[PDB]
Design a protein around this ligand. Sequence first.
Ligand SMILES: [Zn+2]
Ligand SMILES: [Zn+2]
Ligand SMILES: [Zn+2]
Lengths: 146, 284, 165, 160
Amino acid sequence: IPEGSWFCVTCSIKSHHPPKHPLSIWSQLYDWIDSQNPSQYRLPDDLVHYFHGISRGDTGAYKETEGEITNLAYCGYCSKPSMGACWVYGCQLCDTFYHKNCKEHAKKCSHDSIGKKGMRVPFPRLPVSCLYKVSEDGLIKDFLYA
Amino acid sequence: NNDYCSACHGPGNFLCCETCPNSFHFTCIDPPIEEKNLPDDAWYCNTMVDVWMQLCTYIDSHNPIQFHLPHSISSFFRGVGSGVMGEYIETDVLKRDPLLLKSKSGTPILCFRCHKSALVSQSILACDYCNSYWHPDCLNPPLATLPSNLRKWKCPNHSDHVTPRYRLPEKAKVIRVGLPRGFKNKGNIVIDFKLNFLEQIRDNVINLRKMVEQDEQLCIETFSKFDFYATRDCELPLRILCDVANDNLENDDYVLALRDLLRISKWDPNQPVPAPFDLANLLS
Amino acid sequence: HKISVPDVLKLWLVDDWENITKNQQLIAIPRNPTVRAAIAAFRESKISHLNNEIDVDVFEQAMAGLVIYFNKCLGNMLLYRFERQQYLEIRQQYPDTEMCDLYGVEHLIRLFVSLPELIDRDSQSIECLLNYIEEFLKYLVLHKDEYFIKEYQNAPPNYRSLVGV
Amino acid sequence: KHKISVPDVLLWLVDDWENITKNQQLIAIPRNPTVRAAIAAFRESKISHLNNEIDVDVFEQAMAGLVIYFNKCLGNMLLYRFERQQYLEIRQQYPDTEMCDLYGVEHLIRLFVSLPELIDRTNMDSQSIECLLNYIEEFLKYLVLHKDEYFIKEYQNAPP
Ligand SMILES: [Zn+2]
Ligand SMILES: [Zn+2]
Ligand SMILES: [Zn+2]
């Protein structure tokens, strides 16, 4: 722990310009990383809103909200995902699941073998929009190759 | 009146107006007639789609005007501006003395190709996109005159003469391409004491003796060949003539002239070629 | 008020501007797809979402009003001076034809573009108008071989002298 | 630029979310295999197939940058904040080993899933982002091809 007036990484780059990196694929990524801050992991909001019911919370976790689209955990009673427990009534030939509380809707596909059915787990745009900076050496190696 | 068309601001034969004094090219006017109106003219003196089509029908009584562009579409690309009568000009090619000897930055003014000044051939040219000077006699098309002193000139040593046309959105930025090979584009790229004076004098002396020995050995080997240079290079035309007059088809440079003759008379591949002497009656 | 234009259309507009006001070239006015086919071709493609009836009526009103209106501005304010002469000749070769039957969508996008200006004289209708203006713009740019020309014509030698050249 | 294709098995990521946070658990993070031992696998997997010099040079640059990039990000923005005190626990055990060689490839795929939202903070050109996202999605596919020995099979219900 240093005493006095502590400063974060943004308060660090607030006073002294850090050195930059050469030109490779990750240069700008490195700079962005060094610049901003530390903070926890946040899944993409495209991912948490994928399964029905579940959603983030205020500094929160997998929230198994009660189940009430074309590829989530479809149920044969009310078309609801399996809240809190992905175990449902299925067989080796079943197609749609049925909750353990919805076992009144246990189904059976049109199959030949009688399998074990139970609690289981399953626009044109501009052709020139900007100027590009290049490096002389990649250009030179490109030319020599061609 | 005013002596400019009230639509396009142009000079010419005006249909003027008596009451509301303006001028129209009479085809820049209202529905073009053709011409020829000598008596008084008086050119136009006088919440749903319902009211907006009433706007449509109200546009009638307001004396036509030319079309230009909105401020957002003409002022969008780089180096594009309107004229004074609303035509398209390039504002990046705007703004001569033949004999220049020293620039105002106090440097010599020597051609980029032959290295000599504006005294061997009477005139020199200065590039506006570089720091290079050229003799109009050295460019390869040779300039017979000189450009105007109001448009900029561009020396032969740029790539703008081969990149086709692209126009830039005038607020684009420069994207730093970090991709260390195989980047595709079409030409829109920017690019990213000993204090020895005695040694210098000795350097120069020994270099000069090197050069002297070099040419002293060149002339030794050249000057002993004069006797065969003269013989062959001066009896050549008579050897060519002795080959042609004897009709040597083995002189592979004779039959190439014979093929030039077949290629001048535009021979048709159907007839047989003539004997090599009889094709020579193309010449006379 | 302001509408948004596909940057491809800005590039094309400025190319036409330079091509006629500086390079002395012309659009070959008799248009294979005209301004009247290019509104029916939009109605018959947009009618698939005409669910509510008030919207159907407003869409119909707008399309009819705007074709008859483009007919009332092709002589006033949709031409550069170098395009007035070619006007007369066609007005003399087709005497009593509607203009939104000869000219094309090259001259019609000039009317869509120039309408935050002409709209200054405002409850709902302007918004529903500009909405179809934008959708028409991006419906035209998608069909660049249905509503646009493949070359500008070279203005004839006798033509230049009659306008001021 | 905006999109990846997470193949519909990594059903794992969100599960990873639950245990650490709700069904309180942990990953003890001395790990074998480590990140560095899998990149250097997929590299050797694919680099035997690239034809020209351009392809092998860009692949090599991306992979080296990726080991170094996982190094510099793994600390500040790649942990669920319950594997944070335990991160301090492990930071005292090994002081002389870089972070790119103590974690299996289960945090790396968190990087893989959150990369595009990070390339939407920089002004890269279309070909940089295109090849980058292509390579990392190919890596995700290769990982689901071999998840036997790469991903963990249990969780460490640990004290605070
Ligand atoms: Zn006029
Ligand atoms: Zn010269
Ligand atoms: Zn120059």
